[PDB]
């Protein structure tokens, strides 16, 4: 028998829904509380597919070829002069935030996914955890899973930890067929491409169409080093004067920032220049990370970006989150000495979490500084670091 305990999940995205689904599948009584008034949106941005990230969906019968897009190499290019550093065979598939989210939400349904529930307070005793929401209501559970992302309030309330700026930001853009010339489309299609600079880099790869039937798109990012203080403050302030914590979305950019994005883009080697100048809704997001010594805090658990908050470079953040969710659900599934199992659980997941953070840190120290970033370097490959013993394929 799975637990007869009541579980609340705060945060209804990749980790939240994964946790909930698996607990619901297992008979566990579970609720999701999501700050968002409606079901979600990633603004059509790319996600590199890892096993862990699509594990749940595949288990339910979703065909991989239907939520993702192939590649057959990985390219390394000087993004100023176009000089090719090198290319290696590769077969990453790429999906989109909407594809994963939309798949998970579709499976879960609205009945117990409580929108407009923004946690703002939390407290706990030996039986239960009380949650308080910004709408003035409260819910109660035996266990609460903080699946509330990089700016996790749960983690802020328990530990005082918030993301620390990493020194740089990333512009994010998505192109549709015909928004760039065919030869530029062909340059990036069916490939992950790094455009490396002396002080930053771009990445580009194909992704699925916004809806089932639509054509594939090109996803790209450009990482800029921006000095904390005046410089970052001016980049992160929207057209209305609010200095935002994480992203300034396209419809809100200070026009000056948008001109700067285009004008710096003017110096890039043609095909990258064309991504930057032709994107219709580019937007900007800080790079910030955070860590945590424990994921277990009495009856409150942290998973996904709310435990260790990653940087995007190894393209497995959402995979770390799914795994956190899966292993956690399994604990309440197996339901044998919860205190003990959770201790064992967090040890593995912390080591995974810390190792992932170290990798993307090392990656960033090459990628943001024109440091050597060698084609095919196994230390810099996408994916979660091996934490388990290897098994037979």
Whether 71 and 206 have beta carbons less than 8 Å apart is answered as yes
Structure tokens at 230: 């005046």
127 is in an annotated binding site: no
Is 51 an interacting residue with respect to a copy of itself (CB under 8 A)? Answer: no
Structure tokens at 102: 């939309």
CB atoms within 10 A of CB 201: 25
CB atoms within 10 A of CB 127: 8
Structure tokens at 68: 């993702």
Site string for ligand FAD, 168-207 (x = CB under 6 A): --x-x-----------------------------------
Q: Are strands 113-114 and 200-207 parallel, antiparallel or unpaired?
A: unpaired
237 interface partner picked from ligand FAD, a copy of itself, none, CB below 5 to 8 A per type: a copy of itself
Taking CB under 8 A as the criterion, the residue among 26, 90, 239, 277 binding a copy of itself is 239
| CA-closest candidate to residue 310, choices 148, 98, 164, 192 | 164
Is 89 an interacting residue with respect to a copy of itself (CB under 8 A)? Answer: no
Which position has the token pair 């090109």?
Answer: 218
Is 9 an interacting residue with respect to ligand FAD (CB under 6 A)? Answer: no
Region of 218-226, 228-236, 294-302, 321-329 interacting with a copy of itself (CB under 8 A): 228-236
The packing angle between helices 270-278 and 255-265, to 10°, is 160
Residue closer to ligand FAD (CB basis): 205 or 272? 205
Residue 81 C-beta: closest distance to ligand FAD, Å: 26
Taking CB under 8 A as the criterion, the residue among 5, 25, 238, 330 binding a copy of itself is 238
Residue 24 makes CB contacts below 8 A (sequence gap 6+) with 30, 108, 112
Is 38 an interacting residue with respect to a copy of itself (CB under 8 A)? Answer: no
Residue closer to ligand FAD (CB basis): 41 or 66? 41
Taking CB under 8 A as the criterion, the residue among 156, 249, 348, 369 binding a copy of itself is 156
316 is in an annotated binding site: yes
Residue closer to a copy of itself (CB basis): 94 or 171? 171
Structure tokens at 119: 């946690």
Whether 98 and 11 have beta carbons less than 8 Å apart is answered as no
Taking CB under 6 A as the criterion, the residue among 7, 8, 15, 332 binding ligand FAD is 15
**Could you tell me which residues are beta bridge partners of residue 194?**
76, 203
Is 162 an interacting residue with respect to a copy of itself (CB under 8 A)? Answer: no
119 is in an annotated binding site: yes
Beta strands in 293-356 (DSSP E): 296-297, 300-302
- Burial (0-12, 13-18, 19+ Cβ within 10 Å), 5: middle
DSSP state of 258: H
13 interface partner picked from ligand FAD, a copy of itself, none, CB below 5 to 8 A per type: ligand FAD
Residue 14 C-beta: closest distance to ligand FAD, Å: 4
**Could you tell me which residues are beta bridge partners of residue 132?**
121, 138
Is 146 an interacting residue with respect to ligand FAD (CB under 6 A)? Answer: no
Region of 17-25, 49-57, 257-265, 336-344 interacting with a copy of itself (CB under 8 A): 257-265
Stated as kind and residue range, the H or E segment containing 254 is: none
Is 31 an interacting residue with respect to ligand FAD (CB under 6 A)? Answer: no
Is 135 an interacting residue with respect to a copy of itself (CB under 8 A)? Answer: yes
Which positions make up the binding site? 13-15, 34-35, 48, 119, 305, 315-319
Which positions make up the binding site for FAD? 13-15, 34-35, 48, 119, 305, 315-319
């Amino acid at each position: 028998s799975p637990t007869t305990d009541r579980i609340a999940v705060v945060g209804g995205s990749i980790s939240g829904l994964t946790a909930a689904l698996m607990l619901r599948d297992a008979g566990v009584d579970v609720d999701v509380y999501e700050r968002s008034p409606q079901p979600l949106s990633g603004f059509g941005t790319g996600i590199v597919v890892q096993p862990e990230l699509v594990h749940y969906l595949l288990e339910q019968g979703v065909e991989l070829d239907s939520i993702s897009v192939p590649s057959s190499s990985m390219e390394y290019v000087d993004a100023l002069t176009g000089e090719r550093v090198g290319s290696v065979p590769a077969d990453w598939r790429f999906t989109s935030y909407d594809s994963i989210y939309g798949g998970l939400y579709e499976l879960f349904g609205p009945e117990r996914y409580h929108t407009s529930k923004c946690l703002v307070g939390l407290s706990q005793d030996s039986e239960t955890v009380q949650m308080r929401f910004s709408d003035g209501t409260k819910a109660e559970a035996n266990w609460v899973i903080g699946a509330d992302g990089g700016a996790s309030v749960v983690r802020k309330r328990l530990l005082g930890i918030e993301p620390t700026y990493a020194g740089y930001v990333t512009w994010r853009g998505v192109l549709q067929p015909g928004e760039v010339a065919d030869d530029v489309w062909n340059y990036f299609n069916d490939k992950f491409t790094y455009g490396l600079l002396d002080d930053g880099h771009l990445i580009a790869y194909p992704i699925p169409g916004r809806e089932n039937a639509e054509s594939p798109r090109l996803n790209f990012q450009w990482y800029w080093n921006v000095a904390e203080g005046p410089d970052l403050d001016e980049l992160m302030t929207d057209v209305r004067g609010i200095r935002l914590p994480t992203s300034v979305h396209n419809n809100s950019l200070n026009p000056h920032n948008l001109r700067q994005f285009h004008s710096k883009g003017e110096s890039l080697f043609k095909p990258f220049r064309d991504l930057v100048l032709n994107a219709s809704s580019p937007f900007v997001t800080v790079v910030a990370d955070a860590t945590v010594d424990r994921m277990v805090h009495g009856r409150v658990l942290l998973i996904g970006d709310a435990a260790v908050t990653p940087r995007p470079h190894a393209a497995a953040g959402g995979a770390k989150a799914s795994d956190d969710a899966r292993t956690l659900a399994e604990v309440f599934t197996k339901n044998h000495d919860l205190r003990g199992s959770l201790q064992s659980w967090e040890t593995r997941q912390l080591q995974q979490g810390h190792a992932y953070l170290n990798k993307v840190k090392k990656m960033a120290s090459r990628l943001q500084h024109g440091g050597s970033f060698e084609p095919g370097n196994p230390a810099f490959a996408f994916g979660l670091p091996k934490v388990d013993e290897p098994s037979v394929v």
